[PDB]
Ligand binder design. Structure first.
Ligand SMILES: Nc1nc2ccc(F)cc2s1
Length: 118
């Protein structure tokens, strides 16, 4: 009875503050853990710039834009895509950032998203 999408406000973290630098050790695990942390309100977002990904741990979980016409209630529609060793699991639009566990780091902003569940 999970609605297909959920409105979330994600804390945006600076990469050097992140204490837990990924969600796990395989593509399936990181997608599973990302979904669980999103559900629990314990997921942050790191915006990708030069130097960011080498400071985080693979596999990566990205949120990517899933369409261009609808940003309901100010929230960009996104979906999850994982990456390991240059191979991506899913295809989607432009990256908004990389998801990481949030364990109390102080954010620099919040990013409003409408996230596709499954
Ligand atoms: N299967 C599920 N994925 C998500 C992703 C995000 C969320 F908030 C809840 C759920 S339940």
């Amino acid at each position: 009875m999970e609605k297909t999408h959920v409105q979330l406000s994600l804390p945006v973290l600076q990469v050097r503050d992140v204490l837990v630098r990924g969600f796990g050790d395989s593509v399936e695990e990181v997608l599973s853990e990302a979904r669980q942390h999103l559900k629990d309100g314990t997921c942050g977002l790191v915006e990708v710039e030069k130097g960011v990904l080498p400071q985080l741990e693979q596999p990566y979980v990205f949120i990517k834009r899933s369409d261009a016409r609808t940003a309901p209630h100010g929230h960009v529609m996104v979906e999850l895509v994982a990456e390991l060793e240059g191979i991506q699991y899913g295809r989607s639009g432009e990256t908004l950032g990389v998801l990481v566990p949030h364990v109390g780091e102080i954010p620099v902003a919040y990013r409003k998203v409408l996230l596709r569940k499954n």
